[PDB]
Design a binder for this molecule. Structure first.
Ligand SMILES: *[C@@H]1O[C@H](CO)[C@@H](O[C@@H]2O[C@H](CO)[C@@H](O[C@@H]3O[C@H](CO[C@@H]4O[C@H](CO)[C@@H](O)[C@H](O)[C@@H]4O)[C@@H](O)[C@H](O[C@H]4O[C@H](CO)[C@@H](O)[C@H](O)[C@@H]4O)[C@@H]3O)[C@H](O)[C@H]2NC(C)=O)[C@H](O)[C@H]1NC(C)=O
Ligand SMILES: *[C@@H]1O[C@H](CO)[C@@H](O[C@@H]2O[C@H](CO)[C@@H](O[C@@H]3O[C@H](CO)[C@@H](O)[C@H](O)[C@@H]3O)[C@H](O)[C@H]2NC(C)=O)[C@H](O)[C@H]1NC(C)=O
Ligand SMILES: *[C@@H]1O[C@H](CO[C@@H]2O[C@@H](C)[C@@H](O)[C@@H](O)[C@@H]2O)[C@@H](O[C@@H]2O[C@H](CO)[C@@H](O)[C@H](O)[C@H]2NC(C)=O)[C@H](O)[C@H]1NC(C)=O
Ligand SMILES: *[C@@H]1O[C@H](CO)[C@@H](O[C@@H]2O[C@H](CO)[C@@H](O)[C@H](O)[C@H]2NC(C)=O)[C@H](O)[C@H]1NC(C)=O
Ligand SMILES: *[C@@H]1O[C@H](CO)[C@@H](O[C@@H]2O[C@H](CO)[C@@H](O)[C@H](O)[C@H]2NC(C)=O)[C@H](O)[C@H]1NC(C)=O
Ligand SMILES: *[C@@H]1O[C@H](CO)[C@@H](O[C@@H]2O[C@H](CO)[C@@H](O)[C@H](O)[C@H]2NC(C)=O)[C@H](O)[C@H]1NC(C)=O
Ligand SMILES: *[C@@H]1O[C@H](CO)[C@@H](O[C@@H]2O[C@H](CO)[C@@H](O)[C@H](O)[C@H]2NC(C)=O)[C@H](O)[C@H]1NC(C)=O
Ligand SMILES: *[C@@H]1O[C@H](CO)[C@@H](O[C@@H]2O[C@H](CO)[C@@H](O)[C@H](O)[C@H]2NC(C)=O)[C@H](O)[C@H]1NC(C)=O
Ligand SMILES: *[C@@H]1O[C@H](CO)[C@@H](O[C@H]2O[C@H](CO)[C@@H](O)[C@H](O)[C@H]2NC(C)=O)[C@H](O)[C@H]1NC(C)=O
Ligand SMILES: *[C@@H]1O[C@H](CO)[C@@H](O)[C@H](O)[C@H]1NC(C)=O
Ligand SMILES: OC[C@H]1O[C@H](O)[C@H](O)[C@@H](O)[C@@H]1O
Ligand SMILES: OC[C@H]1O[C@H](O)[C@H](O)[C@@H](O)[C@@H]1O
Length: 671
């Protein structure tokens, strides 16, 4: 309806305005007039807004700009005129706007720049002239814009770069020269040396090719260039001559992504000894040779996601990676090889990578069915900490498969098709292991020695793996004294022994939802009820949802003094014994939704309700009498505990007089 002012910032966006407001407070610093129907900006209308530092008039229909406007606003730093109809500029236009740091002129249908319109902009940092119809980089006839750091000229009609067109930047230090989506066909000799210092050049979506890229790099020789981006530039092949001009530079970043790059010739990057970050993702490399990556001894990061050619099904055009292809990268720490069709891991695939700490091989192979005692031999001399092996259709893990990985901390084997018995010999050599993910696999059968060789383990995830023999004596988890997180959810488990978690005093998170443990907590269970939560003094989060519980023994939560969150929703509970929650002095969240609860009495819920933050007891068949709900309604009226959907989803069932009536509106005066 009108403008909203908050902390001297006026938001007048999307209000269909044809005139500039005259009733706004005289102390505003920022004025946002975006997405309106303004045709002009007269000086007289801005006389009362002399404190402005920022003016955003983007997405309007302004064609002329009055020079006197900048004299009325002496503190103006940011001016945004994007998406307007300001096609013609003159020397008078920005002549009085001396304190500007940012000037945005995108999508204004500017086709020609005459004379010197930016000569008075001595403090300008960013100039954005993108999405116009310019056919040249010439913006003046004399040395100006000395403090400029960013020049954006993307999506224009520039066909050639000359030195006498960029010579006005002779005293400038450009961190960014954005020339993307311009169909440049010639780089005239000396064109980049016309700028004082050039640090970054962007030529994405520019059809260059091998021959023109070679000429471009010759023009970059002896410049200050650190970053070069040539993404989607149709670089089909590379040779030992393509980047030769870059020998006379200290380039640290190169991006060659999305180029449909098929052949990478020997010694292609021998001229880049200072390169640190290399992006090669989304290409079509058919065969990587042993000398393709020669000379890249300083690279710390390499992205090879979807870099190799796809499977042809018929022609058998599978990608090939020669042995020793990574031996040159002595400083490589992070390697991403995700989503490829590589056949397997050869004996010398990763040899020479003496500084590798992170390696992701997620969905990297066609099928890596079996992990043998030799599969990872080439990583023996790498200080590898993280290994991701998801989505590879792995079926079997044999003995001593990870013996070469003595420094490994995180091992992700989730989302595969593993179906075997875990003997325990699979984990030999993993002396520094912190976490193992084994979730979403075919089947895993445990024994008493399954995790004996890894007593350092702190986190174990075994979700949806059709887990068998967890009821072994002694427990498969017994040697894991330092365990903090255990996920045994979605396994349809029916039997567990008393001592399953004995000695695990440091356990903090236990997930047991979607199993069949109901019988174990019924009083008539042969041998008595199973007290599997005994001694878990540091337990903070416990999930017991969807187990079909209809009985809870009085002493099961006895030792849980530190418990903060308990989830017992989606069960069939009604009658709960007195003092079942008596030792829960740290409870902050209680969930008992979609159960069969009729009575909510003090002798049960009193200690649990004391200092709660959240409560969820929605969708229960509440009994609306005095002996069943009086205390609960009295608690609801005076508590600060957040109870979501209280008015709508907390209804009475029995007696038929109160059927469908909210429990919040009950009368306690009769009790
Ligand atoms: C091994 O390598 C694989 C492959 O790279 C990694 O897999 C990625 O794992 C992460 C984490 O599990 C995945 O991200 C999660 O994606 C979920 C997808 O659902 C999205 O929902 C939103 C709407 O909310 C939509 O906008 C999206 O389009 C998706 O449909 C997403 O639900 C989830 O959100 C999480 O947000 C925060 C985390 O910031 C959590 O607190 C919250 O609970 C919630 O779970 C994640 O973003 C990712 O999709 C996986 N990538 C692929 C391609 O599979 C493994 O993680 C790697 N292993 C390790 C240990 O690093
Ligand atoms: C870039 O790679 C090319 C390979 O395609 C290199 O060119 C090849 O250079 C070798 C010498 O190092 C040439 O071999 C020599 O040929 C002469 C004449 O026949 C012979 O007398 C020598 O005994 C030797 O065999 C080879 O012919 C040549 N290949 C070509 C271009 O035909 C080139 O040197 C590399 N450039 C650099 C140094 O980056
Ligand atoms: C089990 O853990 C103890 C204690 O580890 C410390 O606390 C953890 C929560 C985590 O923060 C670790 O980084 C801490 O070191 C380990 O005992 C320590 O062992 C190391 C090496 O021998 C050494 O610092 C001390 O001897 C111990 N320090 C303490 C806290 O007593 C123990 O080694 C772990 N069990 C394993 C890995 O088998
Ligand atoms: C700047 O403010 C002036 C008011 O001083 C606006 O001019 C008036 O515009 C209305 C509506 O078009 C006319 O009815 C008046 O005759 C104009 N002058 C008078 C007497 O106030 C002007 O439109 C404003 N500029 C914009 C477009 O923001
Ligand atoms: C910015 O303008 C606002 C609005 O005029 C000023 O806030 C007013 O401050 C006086 C105190 O002298 C109050 O009596 C008014 O009620 C305030 N107006 C409202 C409703 O916001 C503010 O002082 C000016 N400068 C700032 C932000 O310090
Ligand atoms: C690449 O970086 C090196 C520095 O490691 C630059 O060489 C130095 O340049 C400064 C200033 O010109 C001299 O004072 C040093 O003596 C040079 N160090 C030596 C001996 O190499 C080199 O100029 C940079 N390359 C480019 C083209 O800028
Ligand atoms: C040159 O390119 C590098 C790319 O490595 C830029 O540095 C990254 O900048 C992004 C900003 O989005 C950060 O998220 C990364 O963490 C940076 N990488 C690292 C580790 O430095 C850099 O900004 C570019 N320009 C410069 C400073 O030369
Ligand atoms: C890239 O250079 C390597 C040199 O390391 C070439 O590999 C040689 O291939 C021939 C047969 O084609 C063998 O006889 C040599 O033994 C190989 N060299 C060694 C010692 O590895 C490779 O052919 C070149 N790739 C191409 C074809 O461009
Ligand atoms: C937990 O919740 C209780 C119940 O509201 C808090 O009650 C005590 O502190 C209140 C605020 O300081 C006092 O107004 C109450 O009188 C007092 N209750 C009594 C008599 O014990 C309690 O502070 C919360 N946290 C604590 C300290 O356990
Ligand atoms: C550019 O820098 C040179 C060297 O410091 C200086 O002599 C010259 O005056 C500068 N150009 C101008 C006028 O900005
Ligand atoms: O979603 C978090 C985790 O879920 C499973 O454990 C996956 O195997 C793992 O890769 C993922 O990071
Ligand atoms: O199972 C025998 C005993 O196990 C635990 O100590 C229970 O807290 C206790 O009530 C029970 O009698």
């Amino acid at each position: 309806t009108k403008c909203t002012v908050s902390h001297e910032v006026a938001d007048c966006s999307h209000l269909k305005l044809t005139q500039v407001p005259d009733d706004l407070p005289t102390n505003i610093t920022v004025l946002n007039l975006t997405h309106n129907q303004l045709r002009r900006l007269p000086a007289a209308n801005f006389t009362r807004y002399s404190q402005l530092t920022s003016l955003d008039v983007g997405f309007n229909t302004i064609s002329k700009l009055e020079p006197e406007l900048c004299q009325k606003l002496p503190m103006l730093k940011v001016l945004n005129l994007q998406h307007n109809e300001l096609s013609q500029l003159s020397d008078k236009t920005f002549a009085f706007c001396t304190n500007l740091t940012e000037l945005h002129l995108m999508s204004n249908s500017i086709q020609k720049i005459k004379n010197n319109p930016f000569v008075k902009q001595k403090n300008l940092i960013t100039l954005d002239l993108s999405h116009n119809g310019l056919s040249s980089t010439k913006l003046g006839t004399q040395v100006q814009l000395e403090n400029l750091q960013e020049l954006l000229l993307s999506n224009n009609k520039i066909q050639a770069l000359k030195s006498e067109e960029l010579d006005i930047f002779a005293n400038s230090s450009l961190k960014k020269l954005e020339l993307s989506s311009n169909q440049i066909k010639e780089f005239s000799p000396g064109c980049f040396h016309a700028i004082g210092r050039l640090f970054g050049l962007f030529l994405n979506n520019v059809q260059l090719g091998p021959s023109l890229t070679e000429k471009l790099c010759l023009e970059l020789a002896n410049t200050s260039i650190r970053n070069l981006s040539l993404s989607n530039s149709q670089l089909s092949t590379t040779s030992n001559t393509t980047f030769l001009g870059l020998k006379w530079t200290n380039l640290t970043m190169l991006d060659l992504s999305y180029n449909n790059l098929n052949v990478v010739g020997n010694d292609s990057f021998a001229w880049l000894p200072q390169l640190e970050y290399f992006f090669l993702e989304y290409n079509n490399i058919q065969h990587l040779f042993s000398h393709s990556l020669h000379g890249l001894f300083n690279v710390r990061y390499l992205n090879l996601k979807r870099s190799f050619t796809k499977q042809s099904i018929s022609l058998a055009s599978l990608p090939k990676i020669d042995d020793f292809s990574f031996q040159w990268l002595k400083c490589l720490e992070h390697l991403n090889m995700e989503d490829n069709d590589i056949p397997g891991i050869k004996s010398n695939m990763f040899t020479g990578l003496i500084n590798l700490k992170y390696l992701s091989l997620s969905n990297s192979f066609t099928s890596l069915r079996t992990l043998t005692n030799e599969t990872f031999v080439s990583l023996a001399h790498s200080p590898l900490h993280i290994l991701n092996l998801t989505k590879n259709k792995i079926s079997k893990i044999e003995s001593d498969a990870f013996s070469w990985l003595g420094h490994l901390e995180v091992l992700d084997l989730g989302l595969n098709e593993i179906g075997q018995e875990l003997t325990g010999q699979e984990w030999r050599g993993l002396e520094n292991i912190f976490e193992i993910y084994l979730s979403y696999n075919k089947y895993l059968q445990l024994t008493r020695n399954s995790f004996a060789l890894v007593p350092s383990l702190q986190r174990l995830m075994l979700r949806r793996v059709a887990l068998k023999n967890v009821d072994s004596s002694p427990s498969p988890f017994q040697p894991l004294r330092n365990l903090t997180i255990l996920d045994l959810s979605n396994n349809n488990i029916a039997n567990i022994n008393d001592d399953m978690l004995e000695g695990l005093e440091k356990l903090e998170i236990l997930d047991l939802q979607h199993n069949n443990l109901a019988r174990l907590w019924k009083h008539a269970n042969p041998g008595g009820p199973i007290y599997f939560l005994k001694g878990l003094s540091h337990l903070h989060i416990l999930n017991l949802e969807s187990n079909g519980f209809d009985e809870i023994p009085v002493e099961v939560f006895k030792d849980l003094f530190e418990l903060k969150i308990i989830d017992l929703g989606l069960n069939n509970l009604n009658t709960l014994p007195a003092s079942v929650f008596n030792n829960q002095v740290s409870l902050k969240s209680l969930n008992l939704q979609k159960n069969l609860i009729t009575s909510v009495e003090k002798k049960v819920f009193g200690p649990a309700f004391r200092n709660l933050t959240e409560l969820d007891m929605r969708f229960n068949p509440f009994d609306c009498t005095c002996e069943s709900i009086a205390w609960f309604v009295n608690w609801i009226n005076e508590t600060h505990t957040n109870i979501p959907e209280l008015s709508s989803h907390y209804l009475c069932n029995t007696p038929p007089h109160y059927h469908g009536f909210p429990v919040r509106l009950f009368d306690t005066s009769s009790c």
